[PDB]
Structure 1
Amino acid sequence: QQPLLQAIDLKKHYPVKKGMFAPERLVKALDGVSFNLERGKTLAVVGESGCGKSTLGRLLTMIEMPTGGELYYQGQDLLKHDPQAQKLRRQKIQIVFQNPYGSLNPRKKVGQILEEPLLINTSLSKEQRREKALSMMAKVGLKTEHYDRYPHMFSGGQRQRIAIARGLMLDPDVVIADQPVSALDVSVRAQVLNLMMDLQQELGLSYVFISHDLSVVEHIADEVMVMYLGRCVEKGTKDQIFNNPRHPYTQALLSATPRLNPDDRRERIKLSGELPSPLNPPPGCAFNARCRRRFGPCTQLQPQLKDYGGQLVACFAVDQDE
């Protein structure tokens, strides 16, 4: 049977013009990511800030169509526009936006924002949808008063919970969560993550959980995928990738995570040398300018995803060692 969600060499290239009259550049925003996702699983997506993660999220949620590659849901093409089918498929995949204030319409009370998905997709009446909205709001620790508030009348940790509430309303199959808990205090971060886990175990939701906080994906992930400059660099179960990070970038990534425990702290493995430019990517391997294991092949060829017993890795030193 075909996986719930499948991506095959997804590419997205953005045209950048210096001005109304100027030569056109092409930003390399996603360079052929590939993965499979199944009912009840979390694929955590981690890596550099500015490496393709929200771009991948906008492809997966059908906010944009890719510049090549393929994308499949339950064995049904997403990119081949089927207007008749789109009606049904539309709800089954949902988004939680990064910096979600812009995703909230300034001139509608949050109650209306929350009700809109149910209004469009369900037969719930005017008061029943209110009830629903309140219910959901209460699950994330939003008060009843807020039903009459406007989006400018909130703080960031309320806006994020508003956005989570809107995404998780419809009982989707797939939630593409772009940093869903990045502005929450720990005491309510725990309540939101417990809701996401309750849903995952109850309904069979799957998550593409984009994150920068590794402590959270160490808990919420089944599988973790590491991205650098629009390319995958490592993939496997979070057990494998926490216990034995093989790709040189993932070692430098997991070895800079903050910890509260004084005795669990380590002096970070520092990185130096010029950051690759997503406009003019270096020849061959992206990480070569900063990497400590660099051979000759690094500046000549690009590493594809080789297998080592389920931990997929895209490096040459790893190959050398195997």
Structure 2
Amino acid sequence: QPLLQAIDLKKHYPVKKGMFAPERLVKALDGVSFNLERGKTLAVVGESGCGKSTLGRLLTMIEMPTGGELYYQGQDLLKHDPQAQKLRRQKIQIVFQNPYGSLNPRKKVGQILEEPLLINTSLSKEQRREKALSMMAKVGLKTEHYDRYPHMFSGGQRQRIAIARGLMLDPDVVIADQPVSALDVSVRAQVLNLMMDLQQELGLSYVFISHDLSVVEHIADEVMVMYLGRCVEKGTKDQIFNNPRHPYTQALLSATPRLNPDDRRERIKLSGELPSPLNPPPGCAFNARCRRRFGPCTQLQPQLKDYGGQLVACFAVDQDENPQR
């Protein structure tokens, strides 16, 4: 039983083109599924509007899904029962993209860290402070920082406070919504080192959401590539960065810049711009942009299939692997 099962998660927000128009669904997420196991990072990669941050919000129940199943160790988290609410509130936690907006600017760092323990635990004030001090210690802040306001800290130190608040209930899963994107190179390195040291000590699993493929290449174990709310390709890090099968994965891994002249790759020349989810194209969502476009691609929606242990959704790969078509 994997630590977290997602089965067919869907998020279909409804919208109005003004008063007189009929309601229409923006299918912001459709049909994602994964197994996450204890001590591993699963990475979600894709450009803007791919659904990657409506996912994560579903996994932490900031927003309720419009279909699918979400199991922690065989217990369905999507039940409304208070007996299940306590479990999901302890076990699954989030670190947000913005270090300036995710901390309350009129509370002391001690209060930002004690708030989770007031709400969820029996602990007296004397015990609560020792958990907060020991957690600041674990993320590399000082005891003297306890009384300071978040405006007294650098962007890197603010992300360490956000991580410490997440870790405060001793979780098993941390969702990380683009967590080092706003940071400079030398402080990005320290926040990445910290997150991997916490995975070695606590045994956390991360669902890590990122537009930077370098960092994913660095930290991830499995990768999900997403386009227009659907997964396009899923596999181990080794497969995705050495034998990418999907035309969009091949485009991301070539549009990503690299230092070493020996690490250059074939240039793939994507035209146009990302489809609006409010006006989605028929068939495969990449058919407006794909080099490999074939007869089925404008008619039918591709589904993930297993090719050599790597899942991919593409009618051209189906024809490469089954020449009988």
Same fold (TM over 0.5): yes
Cα distance in 2 for partners of 1:313, 1:257 equals 21
Cα distance in 2 for partners of 1:135, 1:45 equals 31
| 3-state SS in 2 of match to 1:164 | helix
Cα distance in 2 for partners of 1:207, 1:148 equals 30
Where does the alignment leave 5 or more consecutive residues of structure 2 unmatched? Answer: none
**Is contact 1:229-1:286 (8 Å) kept?**
yes
Cα distance in 1 for partners of 2:17, 2:133 equals 47
Residue 134 of structure 1 and its aligned partner are, at CA, apart by 3.9
Cα distance in 2 for partners of 1:7, 1:260 equals 37
Identity of aligned residues (%): 100
Per the alignment, do residues 127 and 228 of structure 1 end up closer, same or farther by CA in structure 2, a change over 3 Å counting? same
Residue 116 of structure 1 and its aligned partner are, at CA, apart by 1.5
| Residue correspondence of structure 1 range 155-234 to structure 2 within 5 A | 155-234=154-233
Residue 209 of structure 1 and its aligned partner are, at CA, apart by 0.8
How many residues in Structure 1 have an aligned counterpart in Structure 2?
321
Partner of 1:51: 50
| Residue correspondence of structure 1 range 15-54 to structure 2 within 5 A | 15-18=14-17, 23-54=22-53
C-alpha RMSD of the superposition = 2.2
Task: Give deviations 1:138-186, integer Å, cap 9, x for gaps.
Answer: 4444455543333344443333222122112222111111112223333
Asked whether 1:101 is paired with 2:100, we answer yes
Partner of 1:278: 277
**Is contact 1:274-1:289 (8 Å) kept?**
no
| 3-state SS in 2 of match to 1:293 | coil
| 3-state SS in 1 of match to 2:101 | helix
Cα distance in 1 for partners of 2:271, 2:141 equals 44
Residue 56 of structure 1 and its aligned partner are, at CA, apart by 0.8
Cα distance in 2 for partners of 1:145, 1:259 equals 41
| 3-state SS in 2 of match to 1:219 | helix
Residue 125 of structure 1 and its aligned partner are, at CA, apart by 4.5
Cα distance in 2 for partners of 1:274, 1:113 equals 41
| 3-state SS in 2 of match to 1:312 | strand
Residue 193 of structure 1 and its aligned partner are, at CA, apart by 2.2
Residue 242 of structure 1 and its aligned partner are, at CA, apart by 0.7
Per the alignment, do residues 109 and 119 of structure 1 end up closer, same or farther by CA in structure 2, a change over 3 Å counting? same
Cα distance in 2 for partners of 1:303, 1:125 equals 55
Cα distance in 2 for partners of 1:71, 1:129 equals 31
Per the normalisation by structure 2, the TM-score is 0.90
**Is contact 1:44-1:225 (8 Å) kept?**
yes
**Is contact 2:156-2:191 (8 Å) kept?**
no
Moved more, 216-225 or 196-205: 196-205
**Is contact 1:140-1:192 (8 Å) kept?**
no
Cα distance in 1 for partners of 2:266, 2:51 equals 29
Cα distance in 2 for partners of 1:287, 1:140 equals 42
Residue 264 of structure 1 and its aligned partner are, at CA, apart by 3.3
Cα distance in 2 for partners of 1:142, 1:202 equals 17
**Is contact 2:49-2:277 (8 Å) kept?**
no
**Is contact 2:77-2:84 (8 Å) kept?**
no
Moved more, 126-135 or 51-60: 126-135
Where does the alignment leave 5 or more consecutive residues of structure 1 unmatched? Answer: none
